[PDB]
Each structure stands twice: as structure tokens, then as C-alpha cells.
Amino acid sequence: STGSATTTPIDSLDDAYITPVQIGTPAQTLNLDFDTGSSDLWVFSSETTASEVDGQTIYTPSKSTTAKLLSGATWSISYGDGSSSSGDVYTDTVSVGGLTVTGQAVESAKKVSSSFTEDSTIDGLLGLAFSTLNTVSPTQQKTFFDNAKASLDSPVFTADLGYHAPGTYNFGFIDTTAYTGSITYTAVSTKQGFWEWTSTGYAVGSGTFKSTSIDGIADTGTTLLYLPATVVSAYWAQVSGAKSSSSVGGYVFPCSATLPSFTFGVGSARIVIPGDYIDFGPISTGSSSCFGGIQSSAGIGINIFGDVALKAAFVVFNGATTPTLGFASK
Numbered sequence: 336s337t338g339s340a341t342t343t344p345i346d347s348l349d350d351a352y353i354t355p356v357q358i359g360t361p362a363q364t365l366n367l368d369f370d371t372g373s374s375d376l377w378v379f380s381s382e383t384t385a386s387e388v389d390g391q392t393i394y395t396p397s398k399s400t401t402a403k404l405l406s407g408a409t410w411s412i413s414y415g416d417g418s419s420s421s422g423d424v425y426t427d428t429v430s431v432g433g434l435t436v437t438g439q440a441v442e443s444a445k446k447v448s449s450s451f452t453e454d455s456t457i458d459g460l461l462g463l464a465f466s467t468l469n470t471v472s473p474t475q476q477k478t479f480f481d482n483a484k485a486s487l488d489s490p491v492f493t494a495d496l497g498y499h500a501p502g503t504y505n506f507g508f509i510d511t512t513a514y515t516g517s518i519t520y521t522a523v524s525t526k527q528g529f530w531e532w533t534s535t536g537y538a539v540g541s542g543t544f545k546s547t548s549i550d551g552i553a554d555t556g557t558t559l560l561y562l563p564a565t566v567v568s569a570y571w572a573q574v575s576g577a578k579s580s581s582s583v584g585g586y587v588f589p590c591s592a593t594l595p596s597f598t599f600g601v602g603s604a605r606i607v608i609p610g611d612y613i614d615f616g617p618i619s620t621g622s623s624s625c626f627g628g629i630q631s632s633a634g635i636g637i638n639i640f641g642d643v644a645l646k647a648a649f650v651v652f653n654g655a656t657t658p659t660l661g662f663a664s665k
Contacts, residue, residue, distance in 0.1 A: 336486045337507035338434025345456040357430040359399030365458035370556030374468035377442035378459035387447050390455030402427045410442045410470045420447040434506050436483050440476035468528035490654045496646035514649035514663035519604035523658045532660050539570050540595030551638030560643040561632035586627035601662040608647040
């Protein structure tokens with residue numbers, strides 16, 4: 336089997352991407368944020384505290400003939416940005432782009448934090464990291480990908496995120512028309528439950544490439560590129576007037592600037608992030624100070640290759656017995 340679904344930016348800044356997902360019988364279609372940095376499939380639901388729902392589409396398990404309460408199971412998750420959600424658990428049929436899993440754990444939110452409530456476009460998350468991070472207790476549950484894997488033509492999924500445009504998540508096959516050149520594969524550590532890999536270095540603009548190992552995670556659910564302070568300082572030093580603002584919470588730059596590209600290494604290969612991808616626009620409406628798309632990971636504890644980096648590439652998440660990650664230009 337295979338599946339293929341279009342993923343669409345939620346706003347003009349590519350702050351996140353949503354992908355339609357069919358849950359239950361008859362299908363209830365919710366727009367979920369596919370997150371390779373977490374391992375819970377959770378949704379706004381008929382059980383979500385009413386004051387915490389503001390425009391989202393909800394899953395109503397009582398209207399699904401295939402829904403079953405997973406008795407005694409609860410879940411609770413926090414994310415790197417301090418947002419959180421929690422609730423109980425159903426199993427139901429879940430389909431993505433024509434690929435169907437029966438008996439998938441669908442985590443129904445009873446509570447969500449304000450950031451989720453305030454984002455009307457995101458109806459929940461679909462985690463695609465390793466199932467060892469799944470938060471369901473007392474019986475940990477598998478991700479959609481792990482459940483699907485044995486049925487897939489090949490045990491892989493791919494992320495092809497667009498810049499200010501739709502893109503694609505494919506399951507079970509590699510679309511050889513979707514990238515240029517060759518895919519370079521690199522080793523993954525699953526020790527922390529993430530798609531964790533080591534970049535071979537970086538360049539700023541047309542500058543020379545610095546060979547240096549940068550350990551980080553491929554995370555479709557994080558908007559920006561978070562790298563060590565040394566690397567980030569070297570980037571922003573090439574933008575006149577750029578500075579780190581403690582009050583704003585990161586590097587800002589004059590909106591009149593033309594940003595340089597940023598290159599990262601994947602083995603001997605190179606992925607180039609165009610300067611435009613690094614512009615996240617005015618810090619507040621009407622401001623001439625713009626927010627940068629490359630920020631320090633110093634306060635986080637891990638480097639994160641988020642959407643800013645990933646959308647410059649065609650990315651293969653290879654879930655073979657020994658997982659690997661592949662990157663191609665496109």
C-alpha cells in the first residue's frame with residue numbers, strides 16, 4: 336500500500352502545515368499538523384473543554400461506528416514551545432491520502448493550551464517520530480506510520496514542504512519526479528526518540544563552507560531552524576542592522592534587508608536555503624523590524640532542523656530496521 340496527501344501552509348508565513356486526515360466511519364476529516372518531532376495523534380474533539388475550542392473542526396467518537404474507547408488510557412504532552420494538551424483515547428480507523436490504518440490510537444483532547452485554541456486552522460497533531468515517545472499511559476501506543484509500516488510497499492515516508500505553497504506527504508514510496516539530482520542518506524540515532532542526525536557543516540551566503548558536526552532533529556512540527564549560537568551569530572553578522580533582541584525573543588533584522596542564503600551539509604551534499612525562506616516578517620503589524628527564521632538553540636538543549644530547513648529539500652524518513660534520513664535538492 337501507499338498514501339499521498341497534500342500539505343498546505345496555515346498562513347502567509349508558513350508558520351505550520353496542515354494535512355487532511357480521515358478519522359472514523361463515516362469519515363470525519365480533520366486538518367492535522369504532521370509532526371516528525373512527536374509521536375501522539377491527538378485531536379480536538381467533542382470532549383474538549385468548550386471554552387478551549389475556537390473554530391477548529393472536532394472529532395466526535397460517538398458518531399463513528401468504528402470508534403472504541405481504549406479503557407483506562409490517558410495522555411498528556413508538552414511541546415518545546417511550552418504548549419500542551421491532554422485527554423483520553425479511542426481506537427478508530429484513520430486514513431491519510433488513501434492509506435488506511437485500522438485500530439489507530441486517536442487521542443481525544445479534554446484540555447488544550449491557549450496557543451492551540453488560538454490557532455483555528457489546526458485540528459490536532461499527527462506524530463511521526465518514534466513510538467517510544469508516545470505519551471499514552473498505561474499502555475504506550477504506536478504512531479500512524481509504525482502501524483502502517485508493514486503494509487507499505489517500502490517502510491518510508493517523505494516530506495516535501497512548499498515555500499509559500501502546498502507540498503506533499505507520501506507514505507510507502509519515493510516519488511522520483513519530486514526532486515533533482517540524487518538523495519543523500521545519512522545515519523539516524525533513535526536514542527532520544529527523534530529523527531536525529533548529524534549535519535556536516537554550513538555556509539552563509541556565498542561564503543566558504545565550514546566543516547563541523549551539528550547534531551539535530553528533522554522536525555516538521557517546528558517552524559524555524561534552531562542552531563548553535565556560534566553558527567547563528569555568523570549568519571546574522573552578514574545582515575546589516577540585525578541583532579538579537581531579548582525583548583522580542585530572538586534575532587530580528589531590518590525589513591529593508593536582503594537576506595543571504597544558508598547552506599547545510601548532508602554528508603558530502605549541500606542543501607541551500609534561499610534568503611527569502613529566512614524572513615518571518617514584521618515582529619508586529621506595521622513594524623519595520625522583521626523576525627529571523629534562523630535562531631539560536633542555546634535555550635532548547637537540541638538543534639532543530641525545522642520547516643525553514645526542511646522545505647528547501649525533499650526529505651526521506653526511512654523507517655527500515657536501521658532508520659536513516661535522506662535529503663535531496665528540489
